[PDB]
């Protein structure tokens, strides 16, 4: 609040912490971030490299909905099923395998990271990486593609 501010302690000091020589005049190097190529170049080149220039193609009217594809890794596939489903199937030997719908969980692609249990499991996803599919096959499960 105001009572704990530095201004209350600066009362009585003439320069208010801004010095007697340089003072606290209005904008002495310009306004905003102007001058980044001429007199702010030393700051720009050492703290914000790559600021000036053009790189890449333009895409007119980009819509992110067709590009929506969140990813999940293998070491979280068994976290998407309820606890009762995990107790029923994980580590057991059943005639049927649990089905994990990654799309319903809110992911577009299944990526291969971490390990999987040896219990078979069915993974439904729009996309899957090659390593993820190989590890799922090693674990005994299968990947069926959905839309």
């Amino acid at each position: 609040p105001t009572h704990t501010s530095k201004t209350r302690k600066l009362r009585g000091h003439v320069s208010a912490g801004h010095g007697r020589i340089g003072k606290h005049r209005k904008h002495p190097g310009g306004r905003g971030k102007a001058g980044g190529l001429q007199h702010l170049r030393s700051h720009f080149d050492k703290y914000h490299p790559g600021y000036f220039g053009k790189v890449g193609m333009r895409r007119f009217h980009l819509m992110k909905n067709p590009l929506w594809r969140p990813t999940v890794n293998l070491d979280r596939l068994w976290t998407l099923v309820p606890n009762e489903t995990r107790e029923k199937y994980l580590g057991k030997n059943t005639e049927v395998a649990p089905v994990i719908n990654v799309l319903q969980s809110g992911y577009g692609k299944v990526l291969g990271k971490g390990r999987l249990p040896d219990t078979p499991v069915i993974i439904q996803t729009r996309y899957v990486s090659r390593r993820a599919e190989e590890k799922i096959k090693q674990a005994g499960g299968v990947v069926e593609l959905i839309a």
């Binding site: 729009r126 996309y127 593609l145 959905i146 839309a147």
Partner: protein, 95 residues
Amino acid sequence: APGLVVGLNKGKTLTKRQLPERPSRRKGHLSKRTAFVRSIVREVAGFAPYERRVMELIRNSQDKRARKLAKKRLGTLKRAKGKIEELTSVIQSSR
């Protein structure tokens, strides 16, 4: 219909059904009464000067000149080709 998110026929496979006919999409068809009215109007009013010039070019067998003139007068080449086809049909009917 692969049923996947990639491919020529991608997408979830459902039970397709016949969509009902939309009367709005019937627009653009030529009616018998409208064609009769347009024929009468073409009988009463003559041809535009550019239409006559394109007709002369067609009768002189200068197809490229007729296409260029119709394109310049009517804007797009699609409209130019349609006008040339119509004028060619009228010339054939006249002959």
